[PDB]
Each structure stands twice: as structure tokens, then as C-alpha cells.
Amino acid sequence: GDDRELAILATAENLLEDRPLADISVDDLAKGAGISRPTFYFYFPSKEAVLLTLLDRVVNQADMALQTLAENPADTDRENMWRTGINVFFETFGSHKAVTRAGQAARATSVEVAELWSTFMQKWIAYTAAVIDAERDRGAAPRTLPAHELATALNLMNERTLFASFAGEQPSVPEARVLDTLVHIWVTSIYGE
Amino acid sequence: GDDRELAILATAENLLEDRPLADISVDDLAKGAGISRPTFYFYFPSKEAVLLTLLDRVVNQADMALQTLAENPADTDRENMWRTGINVFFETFGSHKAVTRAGQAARATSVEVAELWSTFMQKWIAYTAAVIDAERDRGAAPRTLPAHELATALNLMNERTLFASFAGEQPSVPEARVLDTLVHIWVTSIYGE
Ligand SMILES: CC1CCN(C(=O)NC2CCCCC2)CC1
Ligand SMILES: CC1CCN(C(=O)NC2CCCCC2)CC1
């Protein structure tokens, strides 16, 4: 049923680990999923549409994990507060590196993928800015830059730096160092004057 | 002569302001440059090769401007030191937004463009790290993160945030606010404990 759907998705995520979407075929996806090519087309219009769904699931998984954290304060200092939050993104995207990688590239060619990234980025930035503002209101953070602008740059840093690290780009921060690196820059830029 | 070359380059940069490289033709470039299509192919193997050269020129212009700054210290505090430096990139790339935009997209499809970006990014990060280290050695900056790792994240932030701003992506820092935004995060993360 939608078991077939789940299978198409699992096959695509598995195949994306080995090669880019350009070198994966609908025949490849159908085969791996144990269905014919016409049956594939019943569930998805295109292999592009498969990636879109995989990216949607990863993005929503991150978002739901962040919502959980936001509802349950971990009983910490400001550094571990931000760390735990950044770590949601580090772990979620880091657990799905092939979807992350293919979904990042697809931004250039797919308006739907571009808009999905854009929608969630705006949400995560707004949440970052709300937290910074609450930190300023409680007297914990100084009123320096506009919170939303600061939040924008810090989120864009995270996007670029996490994904470079996961892809092993040259240059990149080693994956085992990237959390500490980002948390330092967040805590210093948010609390520093 | 290489006047024709310069003309091909000017035409391409002009046309990239209006549409992506995919919708610009060799006939478009030849026409604008006042030459035939075979004459074009004498000077460049492909329209992809034209972009590569345009990107090479912009990247080297930034690099040369940074070398000039590095040879002549501006007589300032630490904040204006970093600002003047970031401003080299803000002004150089900001003066060539269409090449910036097309060259960023071309990373995904062109190994030569990927390697060009990568070579200069490594140079600029190494220079950033050298400056941070000299700041630490003089007792002006605390020994926090590994300088090279800090330098990596800050450069990757700048890349992503400048180029989002220039493209007017949603989300992005307004172009008129991006310099102040980046300088704050650099100065706080470099000098802060
Ligand atoms: C796809 C991006 C989205 C933003 N990212 C990220 O680490 N920011 C978090 C930090 C903790 C509070 C919410 C936002 C990087 C990955
Ligand atoms: C293409 C990138 C390269 C790096 N960028 C940049 O602003 N960094 C500068 C800051 C001043 C010292 C040298 C490095 C962003 C644009």
C-alpha cells in the first residue's frame, strides 16, 4: 500500500548514499522497491518528487525535535541550552547525510525544494530570535544587534558549516569539532559586548 | 585580439545580470561580442568556460585587494581592522553579483569552479587564522577555539550570508545591514571568552 511508498523512499535514501540523484533511475527505484515502473508512477510523479518527500520528512523530524526541546527546558546554563538546540540539527541532518546533500543541491533546480528549505529556515530563525529576545528581556543578553538579523546570520552559518562538515568539503570544520565550533560563535555573539 | 576575449567576458557578465547561464547561448555571447560562433570557439571551449574565467577574475580581484590591505595596516582598533577586511569581500563580490550568483550555482556541476572556490577559501581561512593567532600571541585575543577551525566557520558564515544577502534570498540579512552583522559575530567570537 503506502508500504510500497515507504519502500520507494527507503530505496531512494539507500541509493543516494552511493550516487547522486542524476545517476539514479526510476527503474533503479522501482527495482529496489520491488515494484514495476508504472506502479512507481502511481506513488510519485518523478524521482525529484521522491527526494522532495525525503527532505520533507528530515526537515519535519528536525522541527519536531526542536519543538520538544522548546516545550521541555533542559535545566542548564546558557551554553548547554544553545548546544542542546544546535545538536538537534547536527544529529537529525547528520543521520541523513545523503538526503541532506541531495536536497541541498536540489535547491538550484527545484522551486519546491527551495521553498521547503526557505519555510523552515524562516521558522528556525524566528525561534532563535524569540529566544535571544527573551534572553535580553531577562537581562541575560545585551541589546547589541537586531535579534532577527543576528539570528539570520547564525542560522546561515550553521547551515553552511554543518553541511560542509557532513560532505567533508575542502575546506570544512571536522565533523567531530563542528558542534563546539558553532556553539562558541553562538554564545559569544549572543552574550558578548 | 584579446579585445574580443574581453568583449565575450563583458557580454556574458551583462547577460548573466538578466538570466541564468542555462538561458544564455553561445550565439547570444558571440552576437553581443560582435563575432561569429566559430570565432567564439577559438577563445573559449564553452559558455561554462566563460563563467569560470569571470569567476577567476572576481576571486583574484578580491584576493589582490586583501593582499593590499595585509601589506598596509589601517591605523585602527580591532573592530575596524576586521570590518575593513570583510568589506573587501562585501564590495568585490557585491560589485559582481551576477558572476557571484552564477559561479556559486556552477559549483554543483563544474569541478573546475568547485576547485577554484575551494583554493581561495583555503587561502582566506589560512590568512584569517594567521591574524587570529597573531592577535592571541600579542595578548589581544584569548586562546579559545583552535584558530583554524574558528576561521573556517567564520569564513563559511560570510560566504553563505553575503551571497544570500546579494541574491535577496528568503531568508537573508538586508544588504545594508550585513556588514555590521558579520563584523559583530567576528569580533565577539574572536575576542570573547
Ligand atoms: C538547516 C539549518 C537550520 C538552522 N540550524 C541550526 O543549527 N540552528 C538552530 C540552533 C538552535 C535553535 C534553533 C536553530 C542549522 C541547520
Ligand atoms: C567568498 C567568501 C570568502 C571569505 N569571506 C570573508 O568575508 N572573509 C574575509 C574576512 C577578512 C579576512 C579574510 C577573510 C566571505 C566571502
Tab-separated table of C-alpha atoms and ligand atoms in Angstrom:
chain	number	residue	atom	x	y	z
A	1	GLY	CA	0.000	0.000	0.000
A	2	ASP	CA	1.851	3.007	1.375
A	3	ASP	CA	4.236	0.217	2.378
A	4	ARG	CA	5.286	0.486	-1.281
A	5	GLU	CA	5.643	4.229	-0.752
A	6	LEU	CA	7.892	3.668	2.317
A	7	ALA	CA	9.915	1.184	0.274
A	8	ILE	CA	10.389	3.616	-2.588
A	9	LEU	CA	11.615	6.193	-0.030
A	10	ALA	CA	13.993	3.727	1.730
A	11	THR	CA	15.412	2.604	-1.620
A	12	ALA	CA	15.994	6.185	-2.738
A	13	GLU	CA	17.693	7.148	0.568
A	14	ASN	CA	19.877	3.994	0.315
A	15	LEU	CA	20.815	4.722	-3.337
A	16	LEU	CA	21.532	8.375	-2.628
A	17	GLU	CA	24.242	7.176	-0.180
A	18	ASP	CA	26.137	5.755	-3.243
A	19	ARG	CA	25.435	8.168	-6.098
A	20	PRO	CA	23.687	11.443	-6.958
A	21	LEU	CA	20.012	11.577	-7.992
A	22	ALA	CA	21.162	12.222	-11.648
A	23	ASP	CA	22.665	8.700	-11.715
A	24	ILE	CA	19.670	7.032	-10.010
A	25	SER	CA	16.839	5.909	-12.293
A	26	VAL	CA	13.119	5.302	-11.813
A	27	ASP	CA	13.932	1.714	-12.883
A	28	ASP	CA	16.535	1.652	-10.065
A	29	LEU	CA	13.928	2.916	-7.547
A	30	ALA	CA	11.160	0.576	-8.749
A	31	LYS	CA	13.503	-2.428	-8.742
A	32	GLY	CA	14.818	-1.715	-5.230
A	33	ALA	CA	11.270	-1.198	-4.032
A	34	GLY	CA	10.092	-4.456	-5.620
A	35	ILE	CA	7.515	-2.841	-7.951
A	36	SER	CA	7.251	-2.067	-11.678
A	37	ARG	CA	7.979	1.362	-13.225
A	38	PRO	CA	4.236	2.160	-13.835
A	39	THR	CA	3.477	1.214	-10.206
A	40	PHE	CA	6.220	3.671	-9.135
A	41	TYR	CA	4.444	6.421	-11.114
A	42	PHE	CA	1.290	5.779	-9.212
A	43	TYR	CA	3.070	6.822	-5.954
A	44	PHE	CA	5.382	9.581	-7.273
A	45	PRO	CA	5.447	11.670	-10.474
A	46	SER	CA	9.267	11.694	-10.586
A	47	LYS	CA	12.455	10.779	-8.798
A	48	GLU	CA	12.685	14.541	-7.999
A	49	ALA	CA	9.403	14.162	-6.146
A	50	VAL	CA	10.859	11.272	-4.118
A	51	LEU	CA	13.745	13.497	-2.893
A	52	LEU	CA	11.322	16.294	-2.036
A	53	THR	CA	9.399	13.861	0.245
A	54	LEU	CA	12.592	12.533	1.839
A	55	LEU	CA	13.744	16.114	2.506
A	56	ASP	CA	10.268	16.996	3.872
A	57	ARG	CA	10.487	14.125	6.359
A	58	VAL	CA	14.024	15.099	7.537
A	59	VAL	CA	13.171	18.792	7.891
A	60	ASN	CA	9.984	17.953	9.853
A	61	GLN	CA	11.862	15.492	12.060
A	62	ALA	CA	14.312	18.273	12.994
A	63	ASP	CA	11.469	20.729	13.528
A	64	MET	CA	9.519	18.288	15.781
A	65	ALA	CA	12.647	17.561	17.828
A	66	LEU	CA	13.249	21.283	18.294
A	67	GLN	CA	9.500	21.725	19.368
A	68	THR	CA	10.095	19.019	22.026
A	69	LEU	CA	13.092	20.795	23.390
A	70	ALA	CA	11.212	24.167	23.388
A	71	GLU	CA	8.369	22.623	25.468
A	72	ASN	CA	10.833	20.984	27.978
A	73	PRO	CA	13.658	23.333	29.145
A	74	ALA	CA	16.832	21.268	29.935
A	75	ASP	CA	17.935	22.567	33.387
A	76	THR	CA	21.221	24.197	32.249
A	77	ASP	CA	23.398	27.182	31.706
A	78	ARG	CA	23.123	29.284	28.556
A	79	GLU	CA	25.924	27.455	26.797
A	80	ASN	CA	24.355	23.985	27.174
A	81	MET	CA	20.944	25.484	26.277
A	82	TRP	CA	22.222	26.550	22.824
A	83	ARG	CA	24.354	23.388	22.427
A	84	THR	CA	21.356	21.077	23.016
A	85	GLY	CA	19.448	23.025	20.381
A	86	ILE	CA	22.191	23.134	17.719
A	87	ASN	CA	22.677	19.375	18.457
A	88	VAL	CA	19.090	18.688	17.227
A	89	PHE	CA	20.214	19.863	13.742
A	90	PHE	CA	23.700	18.239	13.965
A	91	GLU	CA	22.087	14.829	14.853
A	92	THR	CA	18.994	14.996	12.581
A	93	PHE	CA	20.753	16.105	9.401
A	94	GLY	CA	23.912	14.168	10.361
A	95	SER	CA	21.776	10.988	10.488
A	96	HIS	CA	20.583	11.626	6.947
A	97	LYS	CA	23.652	12.902	5.158
A	98	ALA	CA	22.679	11.665	1.666
A	99	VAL	CA	19.220	13.350	1.765
A	100	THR	CA	20.863	16.452	3.229
A	101	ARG	CA	23.420	16.532	0.423
A	102	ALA	CA	20.958	15.841	-2.446
A	103	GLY	CA	18.332	18.209	-1.006
A	104	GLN	CA	20.884	20.993	-0.728
A	105	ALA	CA	21.893	20.562	-4.407
A	106	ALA	CA	18.181	20.346	-5.497
A	107	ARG	CA	17.587	23.922	-4.258
A	108	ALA	CA	19.161	25.159	-7.501
A	109	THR	CA	16.798	23.220	-9.774
A	110	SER	CA	13.595	22.759	-7.742
A	111	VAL	CA	11.392	25.649	-6.633
A	112	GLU	CA	9.517	23.279	-4.284
A	113	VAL	CA	12.756	22.215	-2.535
A	114	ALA	CA	13.934	25.898	-2.391
A	115	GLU	CA	10.601	26.903	-0.799
A	116	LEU	CA	10.681	23.985	1.711
A	117	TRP	CA	14.190	24.918	2.897
A	118	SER	CA	13.157	28.589	2.992
A	119	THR	CA	9.936	27.969	5.029
A	120	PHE	CA	11.721	26.036	7.789
A	121	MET	CA	14.761	28.328	7.837
A	122	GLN	CA	12.392	31.238	8.459
A	123	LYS	CA	10.730	29.308	11.329
A	124	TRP	CA	14.026	28.352	12.960
A	125	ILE	CA	15.390	31.894	12.663
A	126	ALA	CA	12.158	33.329	14.195
A	127	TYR	CA	12.510	30.862	17.112
A	128	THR	CA	16.201	31.760	17.540
A	129	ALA	CA	15.329	35.459	17.555
A	130	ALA	CA	12.468	34.860	20.144
A	131	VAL	CA	14.929	33.096	22.428
A	132	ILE	CA	17.556	35.820	22.075
A	133	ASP	CA	14.861	38.474	22.803
A	134	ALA	CA	13.705	36.587	25.913
A	135	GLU	CA	17.369	36.380	26.968
A	136	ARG	CA	17.680	40.166	26.506
A	137	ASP	CA	14.336	40.835	28.332
A	138	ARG	CA	15.533	38.735	31.374
A	139	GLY	CA	18.809	40.802	31.423
A	140	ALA	CA	20.974	37.779	30.466
A	141	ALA	CA	21.977	39.104	26.981
A	142	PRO	CA	22.973	42.682	25.998
A	143	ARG	CA	21.000	44.591	23.384
A	144	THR	CA	23.506	44.601	20.532
A	145	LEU	CA	22.478	43.724	17.008
A	146	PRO	CA	18.807	43.389	15.947
A	147	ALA	CA	17.941	39.913	17.228
A	148	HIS	CA	16.382	38.757	13.966
A	149	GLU	CA	19.415	39.784	11.856
A	150	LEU	CA	21.842	38.138	14.328
A	151	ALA	CA	19.594	35.029	14.271
A	152	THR	CA	19.648	35.013	10.464
A	153	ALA	CA	23.472	35.048	10.177
A	154	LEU	CA	23.926	32.440	12.891
A	155	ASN	CA	21.428	30.061	11.273
A	156	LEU	CA	23.005	30.570	7.828
A	157	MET	CA	26.433	29.891	9.330
A	158	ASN	CA	25.114	26.657	10.838
A	159	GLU	CA	23.562	25.554	7.546
A	160	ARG	CA	26.738	26.123	5.533
A	161	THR	CA	29.196	24.865	8.169
A	162	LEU	CA	27.215	21.711	9.209
A	163	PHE	CA	26.630	20.665	5.589
A	164	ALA	CA	30.299	21.331	4.544
A	165	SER	CA	31.373	19.212	7.506
A	166	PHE	CA	28.975	16.344	6.674
A	167	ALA	CA	30.059	16.344	2.994
A	168	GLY	CA	33.709	16.506	4.019
A	169	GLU	CA	34.185	19.613	1.752
A	170	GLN	CA	37.559	21.270	1.475
A	171	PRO	CA	37.513	23.436	3.436
A	172	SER	CA	35.378	22.338	6.397
A	173	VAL	CA	35.444	22.003	10.159
A	174	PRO	CA	35.995	18.340	11.120
A	175	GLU	CA	32.680	16.784	11.972
A	176	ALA	CA	33.934	15.875	15.468
A	177	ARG	CA	34.728	19.606	16.118
A	178	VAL	CA	31.779	21.384	14.430
A	179	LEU	CA	29.345	21.385	17.391
A	180	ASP	CA	31.899	23.035	19.754
A	181	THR	CA	32.864	25.475	16.975
A	182	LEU	CA	29.273	26.659	16.327
A	183	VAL	CA	28.311	26.802	19.995
A	184	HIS	CA	31.286	29.049	20.770
A	185	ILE	CA	30.350	31.521	17.972
A	186	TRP	CA	26.622	31.484	19.065
A	187	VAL	CA	27.367	32.020	22.754
A	188	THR	CA	29.988	34.692	22.218
A	189	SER	CA	27.871	36.602	19.643
A	190	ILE	CA	24.646	36.373	21.631
A	191	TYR	CA	26.039	37.227	25.119
A	192	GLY	CA	29.079	39.302	24.170
A	193	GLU	CA	29.527	43.085	24.034
B	1	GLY	CA	42.510	40.195	-30.411
B	2	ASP	CA	42.077	39.533	-26.705
B	3	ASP	CA	39.857	42.594	-27.117
B	4	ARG	CA	37.406	40.008	-28.482
B	5	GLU	CA	38.067	37.949	-25.360
B	6	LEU	CA	37.304	40.968	-23.102
B	7	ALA	CA	34.147	41.576	-25.126
B	8	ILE	CA	32.978	37.994	-24.755
B	9	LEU	CA	33.520	38.341	-20.977
B	10	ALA	CA	31.698	41.726	-20.744
B	11	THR	CA	28.778	40.367	-22.774
B	12	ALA	CA	28.497	37.284	-20.577
B	13	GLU	CA	28.625	39.341	-17.337
B	14	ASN	CA	25.965	41.709	-18.786
B	15	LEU	CA	23.706	38.798	-19.867
B	16	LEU	CA	24.112	36.999	-16.556
B	17	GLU	CA	22.548	40.094	-14.896
B	18	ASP	CA	19.274	39.235	-16.775
B	19	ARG	CA	19.138	35.437	-16.922
B	20	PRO	CA	20.956	32.278	-15.809
B	21	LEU	CA	23.768	30.716	-17.871
B	22	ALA	CA	21.304	27.900	-18.921
B	23	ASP	CA	19.251	30.512	-20.827
B	24	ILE	CA	22.288	32.251	-22.377
B	25	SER	CA	23.567	30.807	-25.659
B	26	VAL	CA	26.924	30.813	-27.438
B	27	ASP	CA	25.030	32.616	-30.238
B	28	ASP	CA	23.948	35.191	-27.609
B	29	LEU	CA	27.582	35.624	-26.450
B	30	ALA	CA	29.029	35.780	-29.979
B	31	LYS	CA	26.372	38.266	-31.110
B	32	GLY	CA	26.876	40.562	-28.102
B	33	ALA	CA	30.618	40.364	-28.609
B	34	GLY	CA	30.317	41.177	-32.320
B	35	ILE	CA	31.897	37.913	-33.560
B	36	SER	CA	30.672	34.678	-35.169
B	37	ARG	CA	30.046	31.419	-33.253
B	38	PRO	CA	33.234	29.702	-34.636
B	39	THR	CA	35.281	32.778	-33.646
B	40	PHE	CA	33.823	32.445	-30.116
B	41	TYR	CA	35.078	28.833	-30.005
B	42	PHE	CA	38.545	29.993	-30.782
B	43	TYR	CA	38.597	31.978	-27.477
B	44	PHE	CA	36.544	29.648	-25.230
B	45	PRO	CA	35.520	25.973	-25.466
B	46	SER	CA	32.118	26.639	-23.859
B	47	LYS	CA	29.905	29.167	-22.152
B	48	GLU	CA	30.799	27.263	-18.924
B	49	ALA	CA	34.410	28.186	-19.596
B	50	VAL	CA	33.430	31.864	-19.919
B	51	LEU	CA	31.866	31.824	-16.407
B	52	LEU	CA	34.925	30.080	-14.984
B	53	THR	CA	37.117	32.957	-16.301
B	54	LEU	CA	34.734	35.624	-14.995
B	55	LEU	CA	34.724	33.930	-11.570
B	56	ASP	CA	38.548	33.622	-11.692
B	57	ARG	CA	38.857	37.368	-12.283
B	58	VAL	CA	36.451	38.263	-9.410
B	59	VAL	CA	38.091	35.871	-6.945
B	60	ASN	CA	41.574	37.200	-7.845
B	61	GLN	CA	40.387	40.802	-7.579
B	62	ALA	CA	39.191	40.095	-4.019
B	63	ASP	CA	42.412	38.263	-3.199
B	64	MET	CA	44.614	41.121	-4.549
B	65	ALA	CA	42.604	43.696	-2.592
B	66	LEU	CA	43.018	41.655	0.586
B	67	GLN	CA	46.867	41.379	-0.129
B	68	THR	CA	46.954	45.210	-0.347
B	69	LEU	CA	45.263	45.593	2.969
B	70	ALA	CA	47.588	42.957	4.566
B	71	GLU	CA	50.679	44.912	3.375
B	72	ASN	CA	49.271	48.296	4.648
B	73	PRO	CA	47.760	48.120	8.191
B	74	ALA	CA	44.899	50.702	8.521
B	75	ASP	CA	45.681	52.520	11.823
B	76	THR	CA	42.625	51.269	13.784
B	77	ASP	CA	41.072	49.315	16.561
B	78	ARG	CA	40.370	45.600	16.214
B	79	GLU	CA	36.782	46.126	15.151
B	80	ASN	CA	37.632	48.409	12.199
B	81	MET	CA	40.542	46.082	11.304
B	82	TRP	CA	38.138	43.154	10.721
B	83	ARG	CA	35.461	45.414	9.164
B	84	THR	CA	37.890	46.786	6.539
B	85	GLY	CA	38.818	43.216	5.658
B	86	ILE	CA	35.276	41.787	5.461
B	87	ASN	CA	34.418	44.931	3.388
B	88	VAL	CA	36.903	43.797	0.670
B	89	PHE	CA	34.642	40.742	0.082
B	90	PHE	CA	31.349	42.685	0.551
B	91	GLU	CA	32.471	45.283	-2.097
B	92	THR	CA	34.241	42.930	-4.563
B	93	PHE	CA	31.542	40.264	-4.757
B	94	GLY	CA	28.792	42.879	-4.249
B	95	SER	CA	30.091	44.674	-7.375
B	96	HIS	CA	29.735	41.477	-9.381
B	97	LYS	CA	26.518	39.956	-8.125
B	98	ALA	CA	25.617	38.094	-11.348
B	99	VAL	CA	29.037	36.345	-11.585
B	100	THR	CA	28.845	35.641	-7.853
B	101	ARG	CA	25.398	34.091	-8.231
B	102	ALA	CA	26.185	32.012	-11.366
B	103	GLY	CA	29.589	30.931	-10.018
B	104	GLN	CA	28.021	29.773	-6.771
B	105	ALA	CA	25.457	27.633	-8.664
B	106	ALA	CA	28.206	26.258	-11.023
B	107	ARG	CA	29.978	24.629	-8.043
B	108	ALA	CA	27.439	21.796	-8.259
B	109	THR	CA	28.146	20.998	-11.916
B	110	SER	CA	31.750	22.121	-12.514
B	111	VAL	CA	34.743	20.538	-10.792
B	112	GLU	CA	36.935	23.431	-12.006
B	113	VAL	CA	34.630	26.041	-10.406
B	114	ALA	CA	34.392	23.910	-7.184
B	115	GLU	CA	38.211	23.710	-7.032
B	116	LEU	CA	38.644	27.476	-7.704
B	117	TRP	CA	36.257	28.399	-4.869
B	118	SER	CA	37.940	25.801	-2.638
B	119	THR	CA	41.529	27.029	-3.355
B	120	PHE	CA	40.768	30.654	-2.449
B	121	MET	CA	38.572	29.759	0.531
B	122	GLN	CA	41.505	27.781	1.928
B	123	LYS	CA	43.823	30.795	1.407
B	124	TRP	CA	41.439	33.259	3.044
B	125	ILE	CA	40.818	30.945	6.004
B	126	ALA	CA	44.609	30.434	6.474
B	127	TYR	CA	45.068	34.243	6.465
B	128	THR	CA	42.187	34.684	8.938
B	129	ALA	CA	43.699	32.041	11.214
B	130	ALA	CA	47.214	33.723	10.971
B	131	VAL	CA	45.686	37.029	12.029
B	132	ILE	CA	43.767	35.475	14.919
B	133	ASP	CA	46.981	33.679	16.051
B	134	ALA	CA	48.966	36.937	15.911
B	135	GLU	CA	46.160	38.561	17.927
B	136	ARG	CA	46.441	35.756	20.513
B	137	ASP	CA	50.305	35.946	20.550
B	138	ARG	CA	50.149	39.766	21.237
B	139	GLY	CA	47.702	39.070	24.158
B	140	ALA	CA	44.781	40.844	22.407
B	141	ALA	CA	42.657	37.665	21.873
B	142	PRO	CA	42.069	34.763	24.322
B	143	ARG	CA	43.055	31.221	23.398
B	144	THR	CA	39.620	29.675	22.921
B	145	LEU	CA	38.825	27.538	19.913
B	146	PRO	CA	41.527	26.272	17.504
B	147	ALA	CA	42.149	29.344	15.348
B	148	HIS	CA	41.878	27.476	12.055
B	149	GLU	CA	38.504	25.884	12.941
B	150	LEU	CA	37.111	29.239	14.173
B	151	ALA	CA	38.442	30.833	10.947
B	152	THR	CA	36.745	28.133	8.867
B	153	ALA	CA	33.265	28.667	10.388
B	154	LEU	CA	33.520	32.445	10.211
B	155	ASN	CA	34.542	32.384	6.540
B	156	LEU	CA	31.767	29.895	5.694
B	157	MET	CA	29.267	32.108	7.516
B	158	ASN	CA	30.433	35.090	5.461
B	159	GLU	CA	30.154	33.166	2.194
B	160	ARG	CA	26.605	31.980	2.868
B	161	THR	CA	25.332	35.197	4.479
B	162	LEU	CA	26.894	37.659	1.940
B	163	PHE	CA	25.635	35.656	-1.050
B	164	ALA	CA	22.089	35.195	0.439
B	165	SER	CA	22.003	38.946	1.016
B	166	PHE	CA	23.180	39.795	-2.529
B	167	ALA	CA	20.635	37.380	-4.083
B	168	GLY	CA	17.902	38.733	-1.825
B	169	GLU	CA	17.122	35.125	-0.643
B	170	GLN	CA	14.366	34.490	1.849
B	171	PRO	CA	15.687	34.432	4.454
B	172	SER	CA	18.626	36.858	4.373
B	173	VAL	CA	20.128	39.785	6.229
B	174	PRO	CA	19.328	43.037	4.377
B	175	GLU	CA	22.301	44.027	2.299
B	176	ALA	CA	22.529	47.386	4.112
B	177	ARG	CA	22.856	45.508	7.479
B	178	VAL	CA	25.074	42.522	6.548
B	179	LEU	CA	28.495	44.152	7.124
B	180	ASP	CA	27.601	45.245	10.706
B	181	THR	CA	26.036	41.816	11.340
B	182	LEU	CA	29.151	39.843	10.278
B	183	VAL	CA	31.611	42.177	11.979
B	184	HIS	CA	29.779	41.820	15.298
B	185	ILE	CA	29.885	37.976	15.124
B	186	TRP	CA	33.628	38.038	14.085
B	187	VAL	CA	34.676	40.465	16.817
B	188	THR	CA	32.672	38.814	19.567
B	189	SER	CA	33.801	35.271	18.602
B	190	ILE	CA	37.451	36.202	18.137
B	191	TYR	CA	37.905	38.402	21.266
B	192	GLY	CA	35.235	36.939	23.542
B	193	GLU	CA	35.537	34.396	26.365
C	1	LIG	C1	19.254	23.690	8.205
C	1	LIG	C2	19.869	24.606	9.257
C	1	LIG	C3	18.831	25.268	10.157
C	1	LIG	C4	19.398	26.077	11.315
C	1	LIG	N1	20.476	25.375	12.015
C	1	LIG	C5	20.781	25.362	13.322
C	1	LIG	O1	21.766	24.690	13.697
C	1	LIG	N2	20.113	26.216	14.122
C	1	LIG	C6	19.333	26.027	15.353
C	1	LIG	C7	20.077	26.385	16.604
C	1	LIG	C8	19.199	26.093	17.822
C	1	LIG	C9	17.956	26.954	17.861
C	1	LIG	C10	17.198	26.822	16.559
C	1	LIG	C11	18.088	26.923	15.316
C	1	LIG	C12	21.476	24.784	11.106
C	1	LIG	C13	20.865	23.847	10.104
C	2	LIG	C1	33.856	34.027	-0.640
C	2	LIG	C2	33.952	34.288	0.859
C	2	LIG	C3	35.386	34.280	1.378
C	2	LIG	C4	35.550	34.680	2.837
C	2	LIG	N1	34.764	35.866	3.186
C	2	LIG	C5	35.059	36.870	4.027
C	2	LIG	O1	34.222	37.784	4.179
C	2	LIG	N2	36.162	36.736	4.789
C	2	LIG	C6	37.344	37.587	4.992
C	2	LIG	C7	37.301	38.389	6.258
C	2	LIG	C8	38.542	39.281	6.339
C	2	LIG	C9	39.824	38.484	6.438
C	2	LIG	C10	39.900	37.490	5.300
C	2	LIG	C11	38.601	36.712	5.074
C	2	LIG	C12	33.374	35.812	2.697
C	2	LIG	C13	33.292	35.600	1.213
